[model samples]
Target: KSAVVLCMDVGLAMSHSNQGKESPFEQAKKVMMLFLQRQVFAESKDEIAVVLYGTDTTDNALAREDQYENISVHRHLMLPDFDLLEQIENVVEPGSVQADFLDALIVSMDLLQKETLGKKYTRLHIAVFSDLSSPFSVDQLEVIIANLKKAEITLQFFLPFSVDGLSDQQKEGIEMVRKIMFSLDGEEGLSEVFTFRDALERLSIF
Candidate 1:
């Protein structure tokens, strides 16, 4: 019935573990799987795609696409299926790339644009999983938000970071995401910060 893309962060920061459990990258994978499982069982016609951004090293042939440079389209937009869920773990990895949220967003926007063309579902949903470690200026984010608004795409940011202790820069980034979400109207989208358990339950509700 709709189209969704998981713009996941595979940056070096995701390699850092929280509470001595799995790393952030692991948690993000779990979230994506949960979301897909829900869609499969619900029998929704919503399609799914996976985009992995943020590479630390160079010479990544997988992300060599001229338009998607520095980003990998792990999976193109397609209907939800068990096989896709099983392969997610194999593709998503930690410390794979540097965080380039901007590039990822632009590339994903293009993907959604192409997928939604002439389709019944005109709206595209993008779920971003990141630690807010990347540098995103307010002016840049504003422009991106404006473009997303015009494109009629909804952005849901799933931040797996605890609010108890955050560096000043991170705190600011969190606020920026909130502002981005607020710019949209009802049923458009929102941003969330959750621990592993909380994120699991939240995605299940989706």
Candidate 2:
């Protein structure tokens, strides 16, 4: 089984109803909860964690700076359990901030780095669920690309909407991120853009 971390966007945009259907935030929470359940039942040895990007500030000033502004590890690396799912369910609601894909990538890689230090799992991977809205500077993307390449960790992105759903500019931005992810993981990057319906079906089987 593999070790995986799901970096999920819980930002304000997630609250927007997808195609006037269910909110992306709700869909994501459902998907992850089911995914976690499937993982534990189908592959007991596979471990997974949840990392939330775009949240409100906590009492700790440093944590507020580190997480509220961009990203946070809502749940660290751990085995998939019902309790874990409950924890994720509680916090998948709308947040005040906007999610930054690059920042989330950096935080996720750091988590993976620490989780893999003891050589526990042979396979390390990350799956990101977002609307592909966050803008990233070239340098920021470069940093993530470099770090993932160095770590030899596979990355997968699950866009919450289809290409036609995005504006031309948003599509362009997502394309750039996709290309960089390809350069990072070669053929194993596994980046995919899907509509909310397709994403739900696709991720259910993952």
Candidate 3:
């Protein structure tokens, strides 16, 4: 079976700085690209797709292929390429507003529908890049998560900042992310928040 890599996140306020580090979005791309650069992914025919939320410019749904490069606002000398690894690096940007993660997730599913929509042959793997600072309802999100599970989609999320500085609502939102991870597949699901080191280890586990 072929694999599809989905990046989901709410581009919100500039919540944190990396102390001379790459932006959070860049870091997220690094994680995925590094994975693909490895022999495990590069040699295989597995396809990668990136989907973003927070702007009307995006199709407001899943974006497969080179769509990320087109929707981004940057005009770099050499943009990220269509190759799975390069595309991840290209889409990493700044100042993404926090929007509906559930809606965003569904969009990925819908966009990928043409390939994996009908059955379960197409394996779904998603990584969310954001602070998990949304205020949407848990019940609503739970229903969406259930659908994702039914579709055999495996989702992972990344949170670069710490919870200590966030307000209570944002804190709850992070917990919701954990909840979604757990409900999706328990510990087997590599979607839960992990420290840089821990997440790397978790990715190895998968």
Candidate 4:
């Protein structure tokens, strides 16, 4: 599995956490950083892309048409390098807008499809990291999951903060999330309601 997209939330709530602890945003980035570093050392022809939601600026194919906002395909799908790593470390702040995070996933899926076109048998993955602090419409929930199933994309979700800290809206988001990943036929346990702590336990096994 070489092709992967890391979809993370940078919405207003992500930057705020238990005062003495790391913000959800920081933990999400830490998880992504681990993936990036792992990919860099794998010595394979793999590629990685980073897409951020709740960004201060809108810049992406979908946003150009005035549909999706507050989401940016911050980095393109490509082979990782030192330059790309540096860019990933740059500053990103919360934007004043909020949109369905799944919409961002759609955008990412489209990018993955275009990039990998007819390739087969490689790991096509999307690791979604979001605190669900902001609300999003579930209108396209079915279609989005259908798209993932069609593409045979493996998805692993991570919540950087504990669930109880989130609002009721965020809790409902997880219900949609349960439906989203449970339907994937590739692997059952990989699609659990995973938290940042489990990110290490996952590594502990591997």
Clashes of each: 8, 0, 5, 1
Would you list the C-alpha lDDT of every candidate in the order shown?
0.72, 0.70, 0.55, 0.75
Superposition error at 44 for model 2 (Å): 1.3
Error of 2 at 78 (Å): 1.2
For candidate 2, what is the total of clashing residue pairs?
0
What lDDT does candidate 3 reach at residue 15? Answer: 36
TM accuracy, model 4: 0.87
Which model, 3 or 4, shows the larger TM-score? 4
Query: Which portions of model 1 show Cα errors greater than 4 Å?
Result: 56-69, 137-140, 162-164, 186-196
lDDT of 4 by residue, 45-157 (tens): 77888888888777777785546777888778888877666666666555555556887888789889888877653788888888876777767677888878788887878
**Which has the greatest lDDT?**
4
Global CA lDDT computed for model 4: 0.75
**Model 3: per-residue lDDT, tens digit, 1-206?**
55454454536542345457655555555565666566344455555566666544555323445333213212111113345454456644444455566666666666555546544454666656665655454446666777787767777667666434566766887777767777777776533555444455555653
TM-scores of the models, in the given order?
Answer: 0.81, 0.82, 0.69, 0.87
Candidate 2's residue-wise lDDT over 21-93, tens digit each?
Answer: 8777877777777778777677588878777776663321124444435566677777788788677778456
Alpha carbon lDDT at 142, candidate 4: 79
* Per-residue lDDT of candidate 1, residues 1-206 (tens digit): 77898888888777876679677778888888888888888888889988877754332233554434556677788887878877775755666546557668777888888767887885688888888776553446667878898887877777676654565766877776666676775334343445656778867653
Ranking the candidates on lDDT from highest down gives: 4, 1, 2, 3
